[PDB]
Design an enzyme around this catalytic site. Structure first.
Site, PDB file in Angstrom:
ATOM      1  N   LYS A 116       0.947  -1.197   0.161  1.00 46.29           N
ATOM      2  CA  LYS A 116       0.165   0.112   0.187  1.00 46.29           C
ATOM      3  C   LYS A 116       0.874   1.291   0.082  1.00 46.29           C
ATOM      4  O   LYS A 116       1.685   1.392   0.781  1.00 46.29           O
ATOM      5  CB  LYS A 116      -0.904   0.171   1.261  1.00 46.29           C
ATOM      6  N   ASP A 121      -3.416   4.119  -1.987  1.00 47.06           N
ATOM      7  CA  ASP A 121      -4.263   4.616  -1.238  1.00 47.06           C
ATOM      8  C   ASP A 121      -4.501   6.310  -0.942  1.00 47.06           C
ATOM      9  O   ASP A 121      -3.824   6.946   0.064  1.00 47.06           O
ATOM     10  CB  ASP A 121      -3.926   3.930   0.267  1.00 47.06           C
ATOM     11  N   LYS A 176      -7.299   7.948  -1.246  1.00 49.38           N
ATOM     12  CA  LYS A 176      -8.616   8.468  -0.825  1.00 49.38           C
ATOM     13  C   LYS A 176      -9.158   9.717  -1.556  1.00 49.38           C
ATOM     14  O   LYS A 176      -9.613  10.662  -1.007  1.00 49.38           O
ATOM     15  CB  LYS A 176      -8.490   8.623   0.647  1.00 49.38           C
ATOM     16  N   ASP A 180     -12.960  14.663  -3.970  1.00 42.74           N
ATOM     17  CA  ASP A 180     -13.190  15.969  -4.837  1.00 42.74           C
ATOM     18  C   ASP A 180     -14.591  15.844  -5.629  1.00 42.74           C
ATOM     19  O   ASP A 180     -15.171  15.238  -5.601  1.00 42.74           O
ATOM     20  CB  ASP A 180     -11.917  15.844  -5.726  1.00 42.74           C
ATOM     21  N   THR A 219     -10.812   4.517  10.331  1.00 44.33           N
ATOM     22  CA  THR A 219     -10.654   3.487  11.301  1.00 44.33           C
ATOM     23  C   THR A 219     -10.322   4.248  12.590  1.00 44.33           C
ATOM     24  O   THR A 219     -10.166   3.714  13.752  1.00 44.33           O
ATOM     25  CB  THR A 219      -9.611   2.437  10.970  1.00 44.33           C
TER      26      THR A 219
HETATM   27  O1  LIG Z   1      -9.883   3.959   7.483  1.00 48.06           O
HETATM   28  C1  LIG Z   1      -8.600   3.757   7.391  1.00 48.06           C
HETATM   29  C2  LIG Z   1      -8.093   3.883   6.022  1.00 48.06           C
HETATM   30  C3  LIG Z   1      -6.828   3.844   5.544  1.00 48.06           C
HETATM   31  N1  LIG Z   1      -5.797   3.840   6.787  1.00 48.06           N
HETATM   32  C4  LIG Z   1      -4.436   3.479   6.344  1.00 48.06           C
HETATM   33  O2  LIG Z   1      -4.034   2.257   6.603  1.00 48.06           O
HETATM   34  C5  LIG Z   1      -2.628   2.279   7.218  1.00 48.06           C
HETATM   35  C6  LIG Z   1      -2.863   1.707   8.626  1.00 48.06           C
HETATM   36  O3  LIG Z   1      -1.569   1.419   8.983  1.00 48.06           O
HETATM   37  P1  LIG Z   1      -1.256   1.322  10.676  1.00 48.06           P
HETATM   38  O4  LIG Z   1      -1.980   2.403  11.389  1.00 48.06           O
HETATM   39  O5  LIG Z   1      -1.434  -0.280  10.913  1.00 48.06           O
HETATM   40  O6  LIG Z   1       0.321   1.764  11.040  1.00 48.06           O
HETATM   41  C7  LIG Z   1      -2.127   3.763   7.119  1.00 48.06           C
HETATM   42  O7  LIG Z   1      -1.329   4.049   5.898  1.00 48.06           O
HETATM   43  C8  LIG Z   1      -3.655   4.378   6.953  1.00 48.06           C
HETATM   44  O8  LIG Z   1      -3.392   5.729   6.183  1.00 48.06           O
HETATM   45  C9  LIG Z   1      -6.257   3.541   8.033  1.00 48.06           C
HETATM   46  O9  LIG Z   1      -5.482   3.391   8.900  1.00 48.06           O
HETATM   47  N2  LIG Z   1      -7.714   3.761   8.290  1.00 48.06           N
HETATM   48  O1  LIG Z   2     -14.833  22.852  -3.398  1.00 49.59           O
HETATM   49  C1  LIG Z   2     -14.110  22.513  -4.235  1.00 49.59           C
HETATM   50  C2  LIG Z   2     -12.797  22.203  -3.712  1.00 49.59           C
HETATM   51  C3  LIG Z   2     -11.765  21.770  -4.807  1.00 49.59           C
HETATM   52  N1  LIG Z   2     -12.234  22.267  -6.134  1.00 49.59           N
HETATM   53  C4  LIG Z   2     -10.974  22.281  -7.345  1.00 49.59           C
HETATM   54  O2  LIG Z   2     -10.956  23.546  -8.050  1.00 49.59           O
HETATM   55  C5  LIG Z   2     -10.911  23.166  -9.324  1.00 49.59           C
HETATM   56  C6  LIG Z   2     -11.929  24.061  -9.970  1.00 49.59           C
HETATM   57  O3  LIG Z   2     -11.598  24.061 -11.545  1.00 49.59           O
HETATM   58  P1  LIG Z   2     -12.960  24.319 -12.454  1.00 49.59           P
HETATM   59  O4  LIG Z   2     -14.404  23.621 -11.830  1.00 49.59           O
HETATM   60  O5  LIG Z   2     -13.179  25.761 -12.440  1.00 49.59           O
HETATM   61  O6  LIG Z   2     -12.861  23.642 -13.848  1.00 49.59           O
HETATM   62  C7  LIG Z   2     -10.825  21.913  -9.522  1.00 49.59           C
HETATM   63  O7  LIG Z   2      -9.254  21.372  -9.526  1.00 49.59           O
HETATM   64  C8  LIG Z   2     -11.379  20.945  -8.458  1.00 49.59           C
HETATM   65  O8  LIG Z   2     -11.079  19.677  -8.124  1.00 49.59           O
HETATM   66  C9  LIG Z   2     -13.379  22.406  -6.490  1.00 49.59           C
HETATM   67  O9  LIG Z   2     -13.768  22.597  -7.640  1.00 49.59           O
HETATM   68  N2  LIG Z   2     -14.387  22.495  -5.494  1.00 49.59           N
END
Ligand SMILES: O=c1ccn([C@@H]2O[C@H](COP(=O)(O)O)[C@@H](O)[C@H]2O)c(=O)[nH]1
Ligand SMILES: O=c1ccn([C@@H]2O[C@H](COP(=O)(O)O)[C@@H](O)[C@H]2O)c(=O)[nH]1
Lengths: 229, 229
Positions: free
Chosen positions: B30, B57, B59, B62, B117
């Site tokens: 990951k 990962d 996540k 947007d 988590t």
């Molecule tokens: O709900 C979630 C989703 C993703 N991770 C990811 O899983 C890994 C957990 O590793 P550890 O907490 O066992 O060190 C980290 O990379 C973290 O960003 C979580 O821990 N919880």
């Molecule tokens: O609330 C939010 C947060 C971020 N963006 C980001 O801002 C930019 C807006 O571009 P546009 O919709 O003017 O093309 C994109 O990169 C989009 O992911 C939004 O549009 N709204």
């Protein structure tokens, strides 16, 4: 300055073809999930080498430990601004704020996303949220301020309320900017550049209305002229 | 296989120091927000060059258009699995799945995060959420399934319930795996590897209990053997 141009290309050359036609006085640049997933940190170096300040818009939204280390990695990159999701929680945002303490005055601005500008009331209802986008964003904005962050990403439709309730110092970054007669796309809570300026926005993010025009540099310069006047 | 090891290093050499000691038959890897922010896609390519399948990962959370293009960028990267935040909404998750249609069967698995988590009930109450993490995750998981995604990231504490409510085909990826005796950190909804296996999890993500081990490769192999027998 106020203008931030979203570089949302699928090709490094195409993005740089636009950036080479504009000047750092015209705007700062935003690097998002699309270009970063394709290019990684080298693209941030590409923009810094050209004199631009960069808003790294990755919306870190993870457990506190992971979010803190990701924000610190963004700070090591020297970007002007980086953001997180306020709905990541207070413990997450606090871990993020503390991760920037080692970088002192060189730390990037730390912004939290409230409610994405694409979400309307029906969008939040699928998540069980009963508050209007403005009210939920207001709740998230206040939590972000209480956790010590520098400001929020929100719709320009929330600027007047946020500046009044949260103060002038709390910075407001607003995407969802659309000039008259440009397609909304997936955006929902929108405002013209002129309307967003009147509301008190600190930084307005514009992407497709600039990057997808027949002349992107002239479009950007035309918008800047309308606001400077 | 089921085991997925979280590569959460702040230095490329440290990560490869662990990766060089293990084999793809031991686990998948990951790559998270930290390593991707430091190294970008080239690090994922390095892992593919070593024969590992990678869970990217990041996540994504947007607007639909940005998330779809970020998911497409990940598919261009050739990862085995990539995730989004289910709280980004139905239009976003649907845009993400539709973005993978051009890649056919070579598309990565598309997973959505429900409730992190690390989040307990008190953490969600700051967001106005009154439901327990299990109940709120169940709501987000249901939305995720109806949007056509392949599964969710959830706590192993929700696996028995989720497999029954959402079915065998919907895949469950659970972090918060803590062998008895090891510190939880910022994790809140945790289960031992043996407990998560009995609950019916499809893939369990383990981080610090392996990587911070004085011998991570031997620790990982010991966990795999305990689950084998
Ligand atoms: O709900 C979630 C989703 C993703 N991770 C990811 O899983 C890994 C957990 O590793 P550890 O907490 O066992 O060190 C980290 O990379 C973290 O960003 C979580 O821990 N919880
Ligand atoms: O609330 C939010 C947060 C971020 N963006 C980001 O801002 C930019 C807006 O571009 P546009 O919709 O003017 O093309 C994109 O990169 C989009 O992911 C939004 O549009 N709204």
């Amino acid at each position: 300055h106020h203008m931030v141009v979203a570089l949302d290309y699928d090709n490094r050359d195409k993005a740089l073809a636009f950036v080479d036609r504009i000047d750092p006085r015209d705007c700062r640049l935003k690097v998002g999930k699309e270009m970063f997933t394709l290019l990684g940190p080298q693209f941030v170096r590409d923009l810094h080498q050209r004199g631009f300040e960069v808003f790294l818009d990755l919306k870190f939204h993870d457990i506190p430990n992971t979010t803190a280390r990701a924000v610190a990695a963004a700070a090591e990159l020297g970007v002007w601004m980086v953001n997180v999701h306020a709905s990541g929680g207070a413990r997450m945002m606090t871990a993020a704020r503390e991760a920037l303490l080692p970088f002192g005055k060189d730390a990037p601005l730390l912004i939290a996303v409230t409610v994405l500008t694409s979400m309307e009331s029906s969008d939040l209802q699928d998540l069980g949220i009963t508050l209007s986008p403005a009210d939920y964003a207001a709740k998230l904005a206040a939590l972000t301020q209480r956790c010590g962050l520098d400001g929020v990403v929100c719709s320009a439709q929330e600027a007047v309320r946020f500046k009044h309730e949260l103060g002038q110092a709390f910075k407001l970054v607003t995407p969802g900017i659309r000039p008259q007669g440009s397609d909304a796309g997936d955006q929902r809570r929108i405002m013209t550049p002129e309307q967003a300026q009147e509301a008190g926005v600190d930084y307005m993010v514009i992407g497709r209305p600039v990057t997808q025009s027949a002349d992107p540099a002239a479009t950007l310069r035309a918008i800047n002229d309308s606001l400077r006047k």
